[PDB]
Write a protein that binds this ligand. Structure first.
Ligand SMILES: Cc1ccc(N)cc1C(=O)N[C@H](C)c1cccc2ccccc12
Ligand SMILES: [Cl-]
Ligand SMILES: [Cl-]
Ligand SMILES: [Cl-]
Ligand SMILES: [Cl-]
Ligand SMILES: [Zn+2]
Ligand SMILES: [Zn+2]
Ligand SMILES: [Zn+2]
Ligand SMILES: [Zn+2]
Length: 313
């Protein structure tokens, strides 16, 4: 019998020693098996495999429990989707641009770069250790794993056209936003005044206007009586808010927002860039950087800082 020793894992933290038969595929012995994202199920062991760490699909209770604690999912497809993504994201370049980890353009990744740059500028704790560990590593310049996880958690494959607002929404659902509270007042002539409290993701996201200021002064929304009504912000408790609208020409003023998603072209198949407010306005287009003191352009998301706001209306 001819054997090498390897380590199997689902989380790359708990490692299990296996002795593999060199005449048999990884798949015959472990089920689905991956090396740095590369599917090696149907491959047999090379000598240069000796001692290396392979990911396996969980096939005992111990591994299912370790996978849930690391990823916060029991979805049996999750590992395979993560590894197929990583197989591309490990070949992408992650240049530092204006002190932020960006992504050189590849495989329709503009939305993932914009998301990655945004996440480095807002306060967020991820619930799954997999995402928190990879977020820290991405901050420090090694973002391949984090980008692969974003793809797996959003149910997206490499090359697929992605929306930043939807991606941030999915990531926020995997984050601790329980302390986040939003109180709204809706004012209609007929039904009158009704207050609503939102928590978590719905407390930090709004779709309809880019202007946090305009949200405060109220916006015109339909009432279920038939009338238009005024929705306005009463109380906000969150470290940030995210204001989105369909792309439209918008002026961005230095020092009045944290960062913003620029979107150019048709529905779905256009291109994202990222605008960030520093000592001046920086436009990060993957690996490319431009700066200007003023900006007018097609914006769809704006991020703002917050701690505690109460209206005076
Ligand atoms: C990039 C992408 C991937 C997947 C999906 N489903 C949507 C988008 C997308 O186009 N989003 C932008 C920001 C967008 C959003 C809302 C309304 C829009 C109307 C016209 C043009 C763009 C619009
Ligand atoms: Cl493990
Ligand atoms: Cl969970
Ligand atoms: Cl690639
Ligand atoms: Cl979670
Ligand atoms: Zn174990
Ligand atoms: Zn969870
Ligand atoms: Zn690729
Ligand atoms: Zn009414």
């Amino acid at each position: 019998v001819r054997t090498i020793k390897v380590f199997t894992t689902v989380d790359n933290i708990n490692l299990h020693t296996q002795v593999v038969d060199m005449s048999m595929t990884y798949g015959q012995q472990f089920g689905p098996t991956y090396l740095d994202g590369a599917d090696v199920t149907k491959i047999k062991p090379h000598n240069s495999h000796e001692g290396k760490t392979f990911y396996v699909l969980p096939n005992d209770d111990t591994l299912r429990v370790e996978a849930f604690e690391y990823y916060h999912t029991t979805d049996p497809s999750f590992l395979g989707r993560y590894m197929s993504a990583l197989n591309h994201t490990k070949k992408w370049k992650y240049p530092q641009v204006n002190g932020l980890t960006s992504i050189k353009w590849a495989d329709n990744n503009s939305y993932l770069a914009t998301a990655l740059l945004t996440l480095q500028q807002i306060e967020l704790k991820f619930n799954p250790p997999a995402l928190q560990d990879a977020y820290y590593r991405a901050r420090a310049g090694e973002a391949a794993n984090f980008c692969a996880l974003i793809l797996a958690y959003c149910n997206k494959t490499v090359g697929e056209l992605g929306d930043v607002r939807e991606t941030m929404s999915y990531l926020f659902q995997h984050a601790n936003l329980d302390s986040c509270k939003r109180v709204l007042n809706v004012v209609c002539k007929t039904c009158g005044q009704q207050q609503t409290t939102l928590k978590g993701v719905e407390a930090v996201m709004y779709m309809g206007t880019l202007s946090y200021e305009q949200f405060k002064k109220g916006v015109q929304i339909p009432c279920t009586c038939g009338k238009q009504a005024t929705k306005y912000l009463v109380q906000q408790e969150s470290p940030f808010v995210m204001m989105s609208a369909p792309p439209a020409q918008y002026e961005l003023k230095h020092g009045t927002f944290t960062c913003a998603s620029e979107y150019t072209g048709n529905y779905q198949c256009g291109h994202y860039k990222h605008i960030t407010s520093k000592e001046t306005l920086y436009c990060i287009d993957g690996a490319l950087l431009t700066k200007s003191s003023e900006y007018k352009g097609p914006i769809t998301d704006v991020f703002y800082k917050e701690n505690s706001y109460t209206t005076t209306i």
